[PDB]
Design a protein around this ligand. Structure first.
Ligand SMILES: Nc1ncnc2c1ncn2[C@@H]1O[C@H](COP(=O)(O)O)[C@@H](O)[C@H]1O
Ligand SMILES: Nc1ncnc2c1ncn2[C@@H]1O[C@H](COP(=O)(O)O)[C@@H](O)[C@H]1O
Ligand SMILES: [Cl-]
Ligand SMILES: [Cl-]
Ligand SMILES: [Cl-]
Ligand SMILES: [Cl-]
Lengths: 280, 280
């Protein structure tokens, strides 16, 4: 029987003595992408612990904290079917009984680019809540999705640099039949927006092919991709082809030596901000 | 510059003393799928050696050996952009100067199911040519794609069971913008068929979703998916949900335990036989 636990102390009592816990943090409103992570966690540890917490610290004042989808009863029903031992679903009073004034700050060269330039402070909000959730759960492993590629790398290096004894396991991005990367925010899209939304992944597939087919001027590829999206009524923040190892743009020499690359993008359809990426 | 070599003895002299070679065998008419594998190979060894050879042994008399696309000069131009040190492109007199009568035979149970049920003797043709290619190139590593998932498992077990000192590295499937797995045989499809062909991958995504969402009657999912493709004018051979470890159907107990699964399909669109799979 799955335990739903809001209290930090109760969570510690339930997990007392567990040395192989696999942890999957989420913000709830569960879809097939989350469920895929739950299944992967079970191959890497036991028991599997899920968290559902919408973290105010990683939302900016002009973002979507108040309308973020919240469907805890259904989330519970889904987790029950996937052999998950504990759901940690703290209230905001449990996680933040007084305002949070201790923060985990990531490196400037990694936290302030890409998602960090367009969402100032975002990864301070993420690193702070993830450190806290790991200190509550004390897992051996934690599963993060490649869908939030920058996040995944930030959390990996956080654990290493803060000496947290947690191994990070990366999960592949789960997509809808039409190629759109699954996200609770996909719910915000109108019918017309939903029909256009798959164009973001298609654009990534086309930039992938151009790199594989030998095009060396990466910035020109990025610019064409941005213009293609803009002409169809998107407002892109970026399309950026970077090294997987440090999310820096490769030099000419690194392009020739075939350093593994990833193309990352974020782009709005109306007020809804979608992100996706494709390893190359 | 890339060396293109036809003679086995010359290949041996070129690769003499190389203990870290990564090998990528292909049947030519190269597309972005193959190029992806070349890039991955470079991460796992050096030099990267490609081969291009249409293998008569893995085509039945009613299949497409004579029409199989051959575009060697294009293939050479594409490989030159991917850092590839040697193309091994033997003629049929180079590989088979007399009829091939020594054959490597895989187990029945692996074997004669799925692709081997619908293409009798296929994996004997594959295991034979692959063994021969490995003996010619003598790589440390060889890269095979998940697109041919059953092939990938068959070649891995083959190497371990014949004590071939070659590590198999698996590559993720590369799909088109529209989700269709790239294959040199995509060429065969009419335009109408090309527009329908993404439905295979879409059907796999929905099978995946049904399993993740908790449907335990896997045979029922399989039957719907088959019936779905038929109603749309496909001739399906199979849609089958198997365990990744051994390609056997899981017991109810193994479903409950979350043994990693994969859904596999093969289906005809007119005369063209397409295959695809998705890890669940
Ligand atoms: N479509 C997806 N495929 C794989 N992982 C995902 C997907 N969507 C979200 N995730 C991951 O699920 C975890 C929680 O996501 P969220 O619920 O957005 O906080 C994170 O590790 C995300 O990267
Ligand atoms: N679309 C694809 N994505 C990834 N690998 C592929 C793809 N198509 C073919 N391959 C692999 O590339 C190699 C050569 O395939 P082929 O040229 O069909 O014999 C095999 O290891 C295939 O599984
Ligand atoms: Cl909630
Ligand atoms: Cl990687
Ligand atoms: Cl990968
Ligand atoms: Cl696997």
């Amino acid at each position: 029987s799955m335990k739903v636990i809001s209290s930090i102390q109760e969570l510690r009592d339930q997990l007392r003595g567990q040395n192989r816990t696999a942890f999957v943090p989420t913000m709830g409103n569960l879809h097939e992408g989350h469920l895929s992570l739950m299944r992967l966690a079970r191959q890497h540890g036991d028991p599997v612990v899920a968290s559902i917490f919408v973290n105010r610290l990683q939302f900016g004042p002009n973002e979507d904290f108040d309308k973020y989808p919240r469907t805890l009863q259904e989330d519970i029903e889904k987790l029950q079917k996937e052999n998950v031992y504990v759901l940690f679903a703290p209230t905001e009073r449990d996680m933040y009984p007084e305002p949070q004034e201790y923060r985990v700050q990531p490196p400037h060269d990694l936290g302030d680019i890409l998602e960090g330039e367009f969402r100032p402070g975002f990864f301070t909000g993420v690193c702070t809540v993830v450190t806290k959730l790991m200190a509550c759960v004390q897992p051996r492993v934690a599963v993060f999705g490649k869908k939030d590629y920058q996040q995944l790398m930030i959390v990996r290096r956080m654990c290493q640099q803060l000496a947290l004894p947690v191994e990070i396991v990366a999960a592949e991005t789960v997509r809808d039949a039409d190629g759109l990367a699954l996200s609770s925010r996909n719910r915000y899209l109108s019918e017309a927006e939903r029909a256009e939304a798959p164009e973001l992944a298609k654009t990534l597939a086309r930039v992938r092919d151009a790199v594989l087919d030998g095009e060396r001027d990466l910035a020109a590829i990025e610019r064409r991709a941005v213009a293609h999206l803009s002409a169809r009524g998107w407002q892109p923040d970026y399309v950026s082809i970077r090294r997987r190892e440090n999310l820096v743009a490769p030099s000419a020499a690194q392009i020739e030596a075939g350093d593994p690359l990833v193309v990352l993008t974020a782009a709005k359809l109306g007020a809804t901000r979608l992100i996706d990426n494709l390893e190359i």
